[PDB]
């Protein structure tokens, strides 16, 4: 690979601050050589500076943790990817023909209930932040809508799919998703900054605060740090750090977290757009220099995450800006992948 470009990374963070992120940071593990940069503040009211050791909410990167657990269950013979969801969760879905593989690749047609919840950004956050949902509650919200496509027929990202994932994990194992994440992933990889505390609202230890951008341009930022994330759970509630997401996606891509056969299934790509694919709880992004990288993005209120690794896991990058509902920041932070993998032009 090209050398990572730290000057480029510094400019990405500086641009993200100019666009409204209180703080922005990035860590690269380049085959045992670390790159780490941060600019701005973890807490904009106290002025405490952001650092790459600050814990944060990873949002939908959680789906890759859920998918690893599920694929280990496939390895153990407890789950068949082409079986019906309803084989395992009787009566859950009205169409007993929707399969686990379709759910995990966002081809199931299940409507994304969060499109109800967050039509208005700050009101929607205020609605859900202190609510506790069951898994079934969220499925019922989705099923108020008809499916958006026939089973398998179309890619349509939906949080509901990884609510199903968490239900599958809990049913098949008899354990909570927190226990399964801990025993199958966090403990074996020594992810000392990684937690699943749902429905607790506290982020353990030193953390970046999250700042939700209101829909009104120029409006005052909302501290969105402390919330249950119960509207997402196994689709979105993990807490981690740049180092630990780097460790995780390197371990995934280098073949440490499941059989070779199941990693292959995880990397069967459904087209998302002309430069992106989706596997089983995993994204592929194609970079300008002809490199593809593998991992996941997250958007949860106040936090935008990118966490991606090269195909063999030897280079991994995690970037965080502590705002959300700010498309300019989201698009800027993607540039960390170009600077970290493609290097200086
Ligand atoms: C995962 O991160 C998941 N995120 C969400 O579903 C986002 C929830 C609302 C976020 C909120 N937006 C609004 O309130 C909009 N009015 C905000 O704080 O910005 C899905 N994962 C990502 C990812 O995979 O990139 C998606 C953007 C695709 S949605």
229 torsion bin: left (phi>0), alpha (psi -120 to 50), beta (else) = left
Measured from CB, residues less than 6 Å from any atom of ligand 1 are: 59-60, 114, 118, 121, 124, 157, 159, 212, 236, 297-301, 324-325
Specify the ligand 1 atom closest to the Cα of 298. Answer: 2
Experimental method: X-ray
Do 198 and 229 contact (CB within 8 A), yes or no?
A: yes
Do 52 and 38 contact (CB within 8 A), yes or no?
A: yes
Distance CA 128, CA 136 (A): 16
Distance CA 21, CA 330 (A): 10
Decide: residue 210, CB within 10 A, 0-12 exposed, 13-18 middle, 19+ buried.
Answer: buried
The dihedral sign for the CA sequence 342, 315, 241, 58: positive
Q: 2 vs 15, 235, 289, 294, CA distance in Å?
A: 23, 33, 10, 17
Going by CA atoms, what residue is nearest to atom 1 of ligand 1?
60
CB atoms within 10 A of CB 120: 12
- Tally of structural domains, the chain: 1
Q: 190 vs 184, 193, 295, 310, CA distance in Å?
A: 11, 9, 19, 21
Pocket of ligand 1, candidates 56, 62, 299: which has the most ligand atoms within 8 Å of its Cβ, to mutate?
299
Distance CA 38, CA 240 (A): 16
Specify the ligand 1 atom closest to the Cα of 325. Answer: 19
Active site residues: 60
Do 66 and 166 contact (CB within 8 A), yes or no?
A: yes
- Domain holding 189: CATH number? 3.40.710.10
Going by CA atoms, what residue is nearest to atom 18 of ligand 1?
301
CB atoms within 10 A of CB 67: 25
Domain boundaries, position 20 = 1-345
């Amino acid at each position: 690979l090209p050398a990572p470009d730290d000057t480029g990374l510094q400019a990405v963070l500086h641009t993200a601050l100019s666009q409204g992120a209180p703080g922005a940071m990035v860590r690269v593990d380049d085959n045992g050589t670390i790159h780490q940069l941060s600019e701005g503040v973890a807490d904009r009211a106290t002025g405490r500076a952001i650092t790459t050791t600050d814990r944060f909410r990873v949002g939908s990167v959680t789906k890759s943790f859920s998918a690893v657990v599920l694929l280990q269950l496939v390895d153990e013979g407890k789950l068949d990817l082409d079986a019906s969801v309803n084989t395992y969760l009787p009566g859950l879905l009205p169409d007993d023909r929707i399969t686990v593989r379709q759910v995990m690749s966002h081809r199931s047609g299940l409507y994304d209930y969060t499109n109800d919840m967050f039509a208005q950004t700050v009101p929607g956050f205020e609605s859900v932040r202190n609510k506790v949902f069951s898994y079934q509650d969220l499925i019922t919200l989705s099923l108020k809508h008809g499916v958006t496509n026939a089973p398998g027929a179309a890619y349509s990202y939906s949080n509901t799919n990884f609510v199903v994932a968490g239900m599958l994990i809990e049913k098949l194992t008899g354990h909570s998703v927190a226990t399964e994440y801990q025993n199958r992933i966090f403990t074996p990889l020594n992810l000392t900054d990684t937690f699943y505390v749902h429905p607790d609202t506290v982020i353990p230890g030193t953390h970046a605060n999250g700042y939700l951008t209101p829909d009104e341009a120029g409006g005052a930022l909302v501290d969105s740090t402390e919330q249950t994330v119960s509207w997402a759970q196994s689709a979105g509630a993990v807490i981690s750090s740049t180092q630990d997401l780097d460790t995780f996606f390197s371990a995934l891509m280098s073949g440490q977290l499941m059989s070779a056969a199941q990693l292959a299934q995880m990397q069967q790509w459904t087209t998302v757009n002309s430069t992106q694919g989706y596997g089983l709880g995993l994204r592929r992004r194609d970079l300008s220099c002809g490199i593809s990288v593998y991992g996941h993005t997250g958007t949860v209120q106040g936090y935008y995450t990118y966490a991606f690794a090269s195909k063999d896991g030897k280079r991994s990058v995690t970037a965080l800006a502590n705002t959300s509902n700010n498309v300019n920041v989201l698009n800027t932070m993607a540039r960390t992948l170009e600077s970290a993998f493609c290097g200086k032009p």
